[PDB]
From a paper:
We report the development of three ubiquitin variants (UbVs), each binding selectively to the RING or U-box domain of a distinct E3 ligase: monomeric UBE4B, phosphorylated active CBL, or dimeric XIAP. With ∼600 members, the RING/U-box E3s form the largest family. This family uses a RING or U-box domain to recruit E2 enzymes thioesterified with Ub (E2∼Ub) and facilitates transfer of Ub directly to substrate. RING/U-box domains promote Ub transfer by shifting the equilibrium of E2∼Ub into a closed conformation (Dou et al., 2012b, Plechanovová et al., 2012, Pruneda et al., 2012). We generated selective UbVs for each RING/U-box domain and used biochemical assays and structural studies to identify two types of UbVs: competitive inhibitors of E2∼Ub binding sites on UBE4B or phosphorylated CBL and an activator of XIAP.
Residue numbers in the entry: 1098 to 1168
Write the structure that this text describes.
Amino acid sequence: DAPDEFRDPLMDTLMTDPVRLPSGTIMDRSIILRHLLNSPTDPFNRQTLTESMLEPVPELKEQIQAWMREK
């Protein structure tokens, strides 16, 4: 299994492409972008959210790729 900080909020899925929202939530880029196709909102607190507000988390993305190298 994988540590919680490498997984999407509430989910079992590994974030291969983590992004931070302005609120502080970190989640996979592929989830939040598909949510934004339907609604211009942060899905958790309902604030306005657009794609340009998302930030990469390079150190976490690298740490996750490093963890994937344990097979």
